[PDB]
């Protein structure tokens, strides 16, 4: 009997009254439209935006912490080399804005050096991420922005084939150029090659080298696309699982362990993978929201009073829209809790508070690599956790409005079934 239960659950009675009233339903639908703009159209105040940003920064920060300590080398086939030095620019090396891969003889592989092939994949994802962070991530709804990205690396040493025609696609090693396209979006890549003799004016380094420049145009900077880059970054590290060994500064904070394999940071890597996974799911709710717009008013028809049992075919879409917004908000929260040092323990807590959430650059804008970036995240991790929490606190009203819209729609889906 229904009186007997509206006795105890008086808020259920209010819910039913609202579900029978077009003007309460239309108010809830307006609320959903405004909260959707907060979630997918804003930046500072969107918890969804802040959580995407945080997932990306944690991946980037992870490599800023460990990249300088990571062995790499060999030749183009993932094979060992006799005397190859390959240097990647705008990377966070030891007292340097480049990372040098020059470990010879050892076979690239697990607990060994990272192959140049893996490093190239890693490096490209990194350069793209840092260029986009530097320019500022767009709101979640902006799906067609692009960024331009340029990066360089060099090869020296006898037998080094990492800058050759097969590695590169480029015909003349001195002065040649090649263009190729790729993917929903077309990205153009221009690769050019130049040789610099040991004697040339300039040329600190005693030695002859080849320089490769890559210029990518039309790189998508949408959230979904940047998350895919962050995933490539962290998965390449975890799959390649190269040897590292760290310089622990006398004084400083202490990195444990000091030698080992990169995939040995298992809690850190799992956490970051899980953040990215949750942010990809979060960004997927965008299309659910878009395809179920709530801006058309609803009512009875032919001037007949509204009948909640027959006139409510919109409810399904309203519920899917409300549920999707709630899901964004919960996943945004869950990204934050995965990395927030307040709920972390032991070695993983030390990693985040001592390294990942710090920056040693002498704030520098996001995406800047200096000779002091190494061993620190330099990716605004702490500021982003704070801004995520601030944005969630400023979403108190909208969250209740979303729950209410969901309860209304769900009451109407029930009545119509």
């Amino acid at each position, epitope marked *: 009997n229904l009186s007997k239960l509206l006795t105890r659950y008086s808020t259920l009675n*209010t819910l039913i009254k609202l579900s029978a009233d077009p003007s309460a339903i239309n108010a809830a639908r307006e609320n959903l439209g405004a909260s959707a703009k907060n979630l997918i159209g804003d930046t500072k105040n969107s918890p969804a935006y802040q959580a995407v940003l945080l997932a990306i920064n944690a991946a980037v920060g992870f490599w800023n912490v460990l990249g300088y300590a990571t062995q790499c080398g060999g030749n183009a086939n993932g094979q060992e080399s006799t005397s190859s030095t390959t240097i990647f620019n705008n990377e966070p090396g030891y007292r340097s804005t480049s990372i040098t891969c020059s470990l010879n003889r050892y076979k690239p592989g697990y607990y060994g050096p990272m192959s140049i092939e893996n490093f190239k994949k890693l490096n490209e994802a990194y350069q793209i991420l840092q260029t986009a962070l530097n320019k500022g991530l767009p709101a979640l709804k902006e799906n067609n922005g692009t960024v331009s990205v340029t990066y360089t690396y060099t090869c020296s040493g006898e037998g080094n084939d990492n800058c050759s025609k097969k590695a590169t696609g480029v015909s003349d090693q001195n002065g040649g150029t090649k263009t190729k396209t790729q993917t929903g979006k077309t990205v153009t890549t221009t690769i050019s090659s130049k040789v610099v003799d040991s004697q040339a004016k300039g040329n600190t380094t005693r030695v002859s080298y080849t320089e490769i420049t890559n210029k990518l145009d039309g790189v998508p900077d949408s959230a979904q696309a940047l998350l895919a880059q962050a995933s490539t970054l962290i998965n390449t590290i975890n799959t390649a699982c190269p040897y590292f060994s760290v310089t622990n500064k006398s004084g400083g904070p202490q990195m444990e362990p000091t030698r080992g394999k990169l995939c040995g940071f298992t809690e850190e890597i799992s956490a970051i993978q899980k953040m990215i996974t949750d942010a990809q799911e979060l960004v997927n709710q965008t299309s659910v929201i878009n395809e179920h717009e709530q801006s058309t008013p609803v009512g009875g028809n032919n001037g007949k009073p509204f009948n909640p049992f027959t006139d409510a075919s919109f409810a399904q879409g309203m519920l899917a829209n409300a549920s999707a917004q709630a899901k964004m908000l919960n996943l945004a929260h869950q990204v934050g*809790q995965t990395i927030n040092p*307040d709920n972390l323990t032991g070695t993983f807590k030390n990693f985040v508070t001592g390294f990942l959430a710090t920056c040693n650059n002498k704030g520098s804008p996001p995406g800047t690599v200096t000779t002091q970036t190494f061993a620190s995240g330099c990716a605004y991790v702490e500021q982003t956790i704070t801004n995520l929490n*601030n944005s*969630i*606190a*400023h979403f*108190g009203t909208q969250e209740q409005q979303i729950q209410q819209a969901e309860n209304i729609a769900d009451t109407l889906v029930n009545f119509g079934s």
Partner: nanobody
Framework: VQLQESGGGLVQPGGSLRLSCAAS????????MGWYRQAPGKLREWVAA???????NYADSVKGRFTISRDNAKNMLYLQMSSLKPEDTALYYC????????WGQGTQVTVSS
């Protein structure tokens, strides 16, 4: 997984009251926390929130009259209410934001002359 409000009662307009909420660690720690209320004939309304670092914000209906605070060592959330009005009469609840989906009992506040 526990939310326990207390401190409510019947007071006079113009009056004061301080509400308490004991929350479990897993709800409270490193989360935004907040207060809500449910008045007769209405659904639950958000009232105030506070970040782990202590930054408070408020709904317009209570701003300048209520103060939310938190005690991170004891997992306690507080709402100091002043210049109370009949319209502040309601069941008050605390939760994290976003909400854990089981609400506690709440605590009744009645303001009446």
């Amino acid at each position: 997984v526990q939310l326990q409000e207390s401190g409510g009662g019947l007071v006079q307009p113009g009056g004061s009251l301080r509400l308490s909420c004991a929350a479990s660690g897993s709800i409270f720690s490193g989360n935004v926390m907040g207060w809500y209320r449910q008045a007769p004939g209405k659904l639950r309304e958000w009232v105030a929130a506070i970040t782990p670092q202590g930054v408070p914000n408020y709904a317009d209906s209570v701003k300048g009259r209520f103060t939310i605070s938190r005690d991170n060592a004891k997992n306690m959330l507080y709402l100091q209410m002043s210049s109370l009005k009949p319209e502040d009469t309601a069941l008050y609840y605390c939760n994290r934001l976003p909400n854990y989906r089981s609400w506690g009992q709440g605590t009744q506040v009645t303001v009446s002359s």
